[PDB]
Write an enzyme that holds these catalytic residues in place. Structure first.
Site, PDB file in Angstrom:
ATOM      1  CE  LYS A 215      -0.665   3.164  -3.352  1.00 48.65           C
ATOM      2  NZ  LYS A 215      -0.063   2.270  -4.395  1.00 48.65           N
TER       3      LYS A 215
ATOM      4  CB  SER B  75      -0.172  -0.134   3.426  1.00 46.08           C
ATOM      5  OG  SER B  75      -1.086   0.892   3.110  1.00 46.08           O
TER       6      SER B  75
END
Ligand SMILES: [Fe+3]
Length: 321
Positions: A69, A255
């Protein structure tokens, strides 16, 4: 302090050069971690051992899936300083005075930047999909492009599983068809080198590669571009003759606890102090002779911040493979 992920030993040497030049002028600090591939750096960034790495569009994609991610925080900016762009053009270069066009590519010899890269795989294999003998999964896409071209050099591919895909690769021993600078037909410049050497008939690279690598004008004239309407235009006409306009390479970070203000502050000041024509001591967008694009792309002119709440998929553009 931002830890950059270096993919090779010449990247790490540039990284350490970057670090000592930042300390020298009182910029924000950068430390360096070494890894062997882009995926190991993606893994290192998500495991909290590194904070940043510049990735190509095909790998921005792979970094944005679970469990990684990663997200794009800063795009590389290309073009001229009076006319900048956060995108590039995937093109297909060939030697001038040829019969062929894009649709009659069956059985020829292909030179690719790497397996699952933007301009060297994702783009050309996507554009050439109607011409292939693919019946869909679970047969891998490599096998169908292995029957299409008679021989290729697609770095990162399996030597055992798809031997035809590595045949034109000029690496020695355990480096032939390896996804690194040890294989000399790797990347934008290596794939162009595979055409220049007479090994392949076509090279799937980006638009500036023949302007960079061929400084002499007479030799750039020896190449031309295969347009998708099935005509042949020259290398200065990429703007109308290209396979796709693709989003630029971006620095990816986490993130969640990604330190993206630190990453940006390091990039803005590095660009300011060591950008195009700024210092003669360090160049952030140049590499030593014999090496190409270490850390960032050569002749990129700066960075552009990606707006918040944009993931890999939103970055890549709607209309991706
Ligand atoms: Fe690329």
């Amino acid at each position: 302090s931002v830890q950059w992920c270096a993919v090779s030993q010449p990247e790490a040497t540039k990284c350490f050069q970057w670090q000592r030049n930042m300390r020298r002028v009182r910029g924000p600090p950068v430390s360096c971690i070494k890894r062997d591939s882009p995926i190991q750096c993606i893994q290192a960034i998500a495991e909290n051992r590194a904070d940043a790495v510049t990735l190509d569009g095909g790998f921005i994609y792979e970094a944005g899936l679970a469990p990684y991610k990663l997200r794009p925080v800063a795009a590389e900016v290309y073009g001229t300083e009076r006319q900048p762009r956060t995108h590039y053009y995937a093109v297909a270069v060939v030697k001038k005075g040829g019969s062929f066009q894009l649709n009659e590519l069956q059985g020829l010899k292909s030179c690719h930047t790497g397996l699952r890269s933007t301009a060297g795989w994702n783009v050309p294999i996507g554009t050439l999909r109607p011409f292939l003998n693919w019946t869909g999964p679970p047969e891998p896409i490599e096998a169908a492009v292995a029957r299409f071209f008679s021989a290729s050099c697609v770095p990162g591919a399996d030597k055992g599983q798809f031997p035809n895909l590595c045949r034109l690769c000029a690496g020695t021993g355990e480096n032939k068809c390896a996804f690194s600078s040890q294989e000399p037909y790797f990347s934008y410049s290596g794939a162009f080198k595979c055409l220049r050497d007479g090994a392949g008939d076509v090279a799937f690279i980006r638009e500036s590669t023949v302007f960079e690598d061929l400084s002499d004008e007479a030799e750039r004239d020896e190449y031309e571009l295969l347009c998708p309407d099935n005509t042949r235009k020259p290398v200065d006409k990429f703007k109308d003759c290209h396979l796709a306009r693709v989003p630029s390479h971006a620095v990816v970070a986490r993130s969640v606890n990604g330190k993206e203000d630190a990453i940006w502050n390091l990039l803005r000041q590095a660009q300011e102090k060591f950008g195009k024509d700024k210092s003669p001591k360090f160049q952030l967008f140049g590499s030593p002779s014999g090496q190409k694009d270490l850390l960032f792309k050569d002749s990129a002119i700066g960075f552009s911040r990606v707006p918040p709440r944009i993931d890999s998929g939103l970055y890549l553009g709607s209309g991706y493979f």
